[PDB]
Structures are given as C-alpha cells and as structure tokens.
C-alpha cells in the first residue's frame, strides 16, 4: 500500500507522481528455511478511493515450519533499500518473522515498482530508505485480521557522510 | 490526494496448494504515512497458514 | 506435465499413482540475473484425456536481459534431483538457457509435487535423478509454439557405488 | 494409462507486468516418457517475452 | 570493526562486553551477479590497541562485472538488522555498490559475530539495527586506501509501534 | 581432484590440456539451512605427482543441524554442468546431504575452473555434464577418513533429441 | 605427462564456525577411468567438530 | 578497557578470482560515538586488480 508513506529531504514520491493513471508492484519473498511467496499488484485510483488488486502464488514452505505451522508472531520493522532499475523503481528489504522461544525467521523481498506514468512525467528518485513498521491483529482466527503500517521515506541522516553526500 | 483515503482491496491466492480469497478495508493519511486496514478471508479459510506472510501484499 | 516420465529400475511412480485424484505443482524458478518465474499447476484426468490448469507470476527480470529482450535460445538438457519431503516429493534442478554468443544463462527450480490422494494409497520413490530434455520452436512470433519433451528417471548407473548404494 | 495419452492446457499469468493466456494440446506416450505439444497464445500476444520461460509450466 | 558503534536506547554492546577476551566474526557477501565475498575475522585487545586478523576468499566475480573491471563507485549508506541466533549474535545487511551510468550493484551480507566469553557471562541485545556509513578514497591506484565509517545502534523510532514494541 | 574424470564422446578434457602449467579451482557452496562452505584450490604436477593446496572458510552453519551436530550420513550421487563463460570453465551443482530419518540437506555448488594455460593454448568443452559419486568411510572419529570417487563426463543421451544437438 | 595409476597429495587448511583445522591427505586413481581413493588426516583441530562431509568436494 | 580515541591495527590475506593479495592497515576512532578512520595498504598483489570495495567490509 505504497501510497501511504512519509517523503523527508525532498525526496519524489514515485507512487503518489503515478496518479490518475496509478501503478503496480510485483514482488518474490524468499524465506531462509525455502519457502517463497510471490505476488503481484495493481494499484488504481477510483473516485476518492484506492483499489488493490492482488495475486498470489506461495510454496516449498516447510511443513513443520512458523509458517505452515501457524505459529509466527508477526514482523519486525524493516528498512528497504528502493533505486532506479531500467526506467523503474526496484526495491530491496529483508525482514524478520518473530517465532516461539524469542526466535526469527528471515526472508529477502525483491520488488519491482511499475509506474502506470510515461517516464517523461515522472521524477524518479535517488537512492534511498523506507522505514517499515507492519503490526497484525487476528481479531477472528483464521478469518478476520487488522492491520496497521507507518512508512517513512529518508535519506541516511543517522550515520552522516564526511564528503557531504546522501 | 486528501489527508485521509479510504482503499479497497482483493486478493486470490494459493499457498502450498492452500486456494483462498481474502477482502480487504481502510483508510490513511497518505501524506502521514500511516494506515489501517480490516481483511477477511472470504474463501479457504480458516487460513490454514500465518496469515503474517500475506501482510506485505495488502 | 509430469505424467510422461519413463521409470526406471523399479521405481515407484510418484504421478502415476496419483490418478484417478491426479497432482498438483508448485515451483519457483530464481535466475542468476535476478528475474523469478513461479507458477502453480493442476494436474486432472478427465475421462481420456489429460487436463492442465496453470498459473503463472514472473518478475524482476532485467529490461535488458536475453528473457526480456526475447533472444534466448532454448535450454540445454537437465538433470532433476528428487526425494521425499514432508511426505510429499520435491524436486530440485538447474537449467541452462542458451544466450546469443554461445553463452548460457542458469536458474535453480524449486518444486514441490503433492499427489491428490492420501499417503496410505502411495509408494513413495527413494532418491533419484530425472533427464530432462526440453525443445522448442516458434512456429508464428510470439503466437505458436510446438514443445517436444523426453524424460527418464533413474538411479546413478554411470557413476557406481563400491558399497552397494543406488 | 494407455499408451498415447492425449492432454490439453489453459495457463494464464504476468510477467514483469504484462499479463497473457495460453492453451495447450498435446499428446505422448506415458510409458515411454516422451511428448508433445502445440501452444497458443490467445491473450496478451505477440508474447513480449522469451517464450522459454514458460517450458517448464506447459 | 565492530568495536566502534555507537549504541542508542541502552542497547547492549555485544562487541564491547567481549573485551578482553575479544571475538570472531564470519561472513558470505553474496553479490546479484554471482560473486561471492568470505571472510572470517578476530579481534583481540593488545593493552591499548584492537589487532584484526582477517581472512578473505572471493570467486565467481564476473570478468566483465564492475568488480572485475575496477569500476566501482563505493558503498550506498545500509542497514543491518541484529538478532541472538544460538547463542550467538547474527547480523543480515543489503548493501548496494554505485556503478557507472548511476546504476547499483546489490548484495548480501550474512554474519554470525561470535563472543570469545561465554553466552551466560553477556547480555544479549535485543532485535536491533545498526546504520552504517562506509567511505573509501583511493589514495594511490590499487595500493593505498582510506576508509571512514560511522555506525549507529537502534530501535526503529522513524515508525513508532502502536502497542508498546521496541 | 578434476584429473580424474572419464570423457566420453570427444568432450575435451579442460584440466588433462592444463598440464604441466596446472590449474584452479573456487567454489562457494550455499546450504538450504544457511551455511556457506567457500574454498580455493591450487593443482600442480610436480614429476609423477599431483599436489593439491586447499583452504577454506566456512560459516553460518545452524548449531542444531547436521553439519555441527555431525550427524550427516554422506552425498548422495550428483550432477554438474559445466560451461565457458569469461574464457573459463564455469561449474554448477546441486548436491544432498543425507540425514537422519531419510531425510536431506541440500546445497548449491558455484564453481569456476582456471587453467594455468591461455585459453588460446586450449580446446574448450561444449555444455556438458559430469556425474559423480563420493563415498566416506570414518576409519577414526574426526580424524582419519577415506574418500572414494567415480566421475564421468558426458552429453545427455539418456533424454535424445530430434533437433541434432548433443 | 599422466600415468595409468596417478597418485596425489594434498594440504588443506581453514576455519568452518570458528573453528580452525588442518588435513593432510594422499591417494591414487586411473585419470582415465575416471575413479579414485584417499585417505584424508586431520593433523590440526581435531577430532573435528563438524561433518567431515562439508570438506568432501575440497580433497 | 576501551579509551575514547582507541587505535587499531590490521593484517589481511586472501585470493579473489586466483588473484592472491595482502593488506596491512591503520587507524583510529572514538568506539562510543561509533566514528573510525583508517588507512590501507596492499603490500603483496598490488596493484589490486579488482574494486577494493568488495573488501571494505572486512577491514
């Protein structure tokens, strides 16, 4: 849902430069115990709302694992990595699924971000950060979920450059 | 766009040969960076996975 | 499309055995360029005939890669691990596409196999190895295509175990 | 099975966001191990892509 | 060099509660375009200097690769995320090296850090993430190098929890 | 030990031509449960002698798996492709480990070979493949072991083609 | 410049986990025929506290 | 144990792609405000022929 994200430092915001014609992602998890989850997606803008459309095909996930097992604890925070790639934007993260006895799991996201625009109508960004925090609530087991996210996009001001780059 | 939106969602899937369908309904601030959204699982449920490897698609 | 595998040395039939239920697949390809190919496919008999139904999510390839830019030339012949897992079969496999300039472009295939009947009805294989031979030509551009495929599964007869293994 | 067993296929995906269909028909022979088929792609054609992705999901 | 962060939010220092007896790192640096970086480190107190011993085996870097050519452009700023994994401290980065013609080269760090003092005798940090800074300057051609970096240990305050985490 | 391969139907044999300059090899090999195995090795003959120089870094293996539990029961049989890529030889395989129960562990080879000659001193391969099979016997608990190994080089005649390649 | 019957030596040296080792090792095999036998000693770090299995494709 | 301005110093050996190299390396930080300088020198292999990038990590 990645018109919902905080732009700091003047940075272009790929997604929200894509309306009215919206965007897509298209995205491989890779789970260290071998699963994958794949999923691709359609952002369009209708009206005054958002509409997703999403596809899914996830598999070689361990039978005994967190996640067949249903027995993970939802994620850390995350930080991705996004940088121009081809003409569009492509994205890099790892995450960390919490799990039984103070546990993680990691995995490796590797999206790319598909502006439905003409390159000639959008700023693309440099390089730079999103600060992810994704927390779920199973209201209804197995049936029925909230969910919250805060996305900040940044440059690296935490650890500064001596020669005065980003 | 507004200091509040409001998103809708669908999702189908299939999940080490689990088939399922799942809705989903929010809103943020798309300036703010922030966002809620409620998802059922319309189809396949209960989920017989965490449905934890579903939240960066929603 | 699994069911056309010549078994050797007496090995029990993973696919086969599955029907009249059939099987299922699920596989994600990973390209050493950084492109993933996943899909699921459904395997049914439908009175004589055999029924495939296939879903495909492909991403991240390079704009400028032999996938994208359509000057791949067809892949080299293969060899497929497989074994049991999770009391299900998976299967494990590099391939080589054939690139302009005598190149080659490798992937590494993850698949599981899960038959449609119970584990009390199957004969489960012991390790073994799948030949593959896949060939193809384009019979109008971008339109038709005609696959030829010849598989054979087998033990390691080539390379022989001085203690009595497979 | 017998030994020339017919099949047919329906196949749809994106890749790299172009979205496409395909059928399939063919026949082999089970025992044996060998086969072959004829591929058409009926949506999101000419295909813009290597073709040879897609072998292995036929 | 491990020694020198600077940790936030009472975060326990690993690193500097191994001192005197020191630690080991061990890291594979597994780049996008098939090369591959190992290396294996100790650090060891010698009265009031800090001695690294460091191993190193790389391969299978492409010839025509930025690497290869000697065209890199330095290290984007990155993120690590830090986690207790046996025992034993574990750390997971993306890190993108700039090429000509704006583009980056990604890769992954997988690292295990390991304590020479005993499990019980440190306090283990929680899941955490370290910013890092890395600037080179080539001094004289292939010979002579200068490198600054500046690392920082934190929780994610950029996107604040709803429920009360870290 | 490349020297002791059987080349079948006139496939050039890439490391008997590299003699008496000799070769090397690098490999990393990557675990399915984390573990990087990474070595570099120096072939010389020296009179009637073949001398080997091997080093290696390992890292990241789970303290609970079978690697440092040392409860691996040996390879099964496995096979490699090769091809040239960057004027040398190019090696790629998957490999399982047995375990406890019937189960595996499986790995990723990435290889490449360097003759010590020219490659315009050397007839190259095509595409092909090489079957191996390594057998152990423990003679001492962790400190006396023998190595048995079968290799063969061949093209695919297993699965035939009808377009008249290899 | 190779015999029927080809014998070999090796040194081998590394770190797996932290945990440093040495192996020496000999053998013979037919180059031709493509088979071979050694014997591999661990001279350094012993006994091992590792599958021996992971150092297989390095002797 | 540790003084607000802490040196160090560094020896490393390796092989990238056959290309066998050594370093030596000095420098100095502040090990709480998590800053460090150093200074790098190949003295075995130069000049290096690959980016040194890929060995900033293990410096």
């Given at each position: 849902?990645?018109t ?7 940075i272009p915001?790929?997604?929200?430069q ?5 965007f897509?992602?298209?995205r ?9 989850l ?5 952002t369009?803008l209708d009206?005054?709302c958002?509409?997703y459309?999403?596809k899914?095909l996830?598999?070689?996930?361990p039978?005994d694992?967190p996640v ?10 995350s930080?991705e990595?996004?940088?121009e790639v081809d ?5 890099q993260?790892?995450?960390a ?7 993680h799991?990691?995995?490796?996201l ?12 959008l ?5 730079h950060?999103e600060d ?7 209201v ?9 996210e805060?996305?900040?996009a940044?440059?690296c001001?935490?650890?500064?450059s ?5 | 766009?507004?200091?509040?939106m409001?998103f809708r ?13 799942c809705?989903?309904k ?8 922030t966002?809620d959204?409620?998802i059922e ?9 965490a449905f934890?490897?579903?939240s960066?698609?929603?």
């Amino acid at each position: 849902s990645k018109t919902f994200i905080k732009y700091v430092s003047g940075i272009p915001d790929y997604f929200k430069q894509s309306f009215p014609e919206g965007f897509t992602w298209e995205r491989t998890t890779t789970y260290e115990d071998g699963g994958f989850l794949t999923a691709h997606q359609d952002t369009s803008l209708d009206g005054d709302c958002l509409v997703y459309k999403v596809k899914i095909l996830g598999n070689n996930f361990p039978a005994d694992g967190p996640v067949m097992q249903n027995k993970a604890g939802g994620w850390e925070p995350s930080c991705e990595i996004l940088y121009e790639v081809d003409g569009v934007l492509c994205g890099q993260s790892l995450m960390a699924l919490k799990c039984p006895g103070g546990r993680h799991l990691n995995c490796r996201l590797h999206t790319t971000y598909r502006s439905k625009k003409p390159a000639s109508a959008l700023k693309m960004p440099e390089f730079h950060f999103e600060d992810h925090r994704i927390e779920v609530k199973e209201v209804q087991k197995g049936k029925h979920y909230e969910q919250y996210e805060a996305a900040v996009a940044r440059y690296c001001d935490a650890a500064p450059s001596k020669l005065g780059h980003h | 766009l507004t200091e509040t939106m409001p998103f809708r969602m669908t999702m189908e899937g299939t999940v080490n040969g689990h088939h399922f369908k799942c809705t989903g309904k929010g809103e943020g601030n798309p300036f703010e960076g922030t966002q809620d959204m409620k998802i059922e699982v319309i189809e396949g449920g209960p989920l017989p996975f965490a449905f934890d490897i579903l939240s960066t698609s929603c």
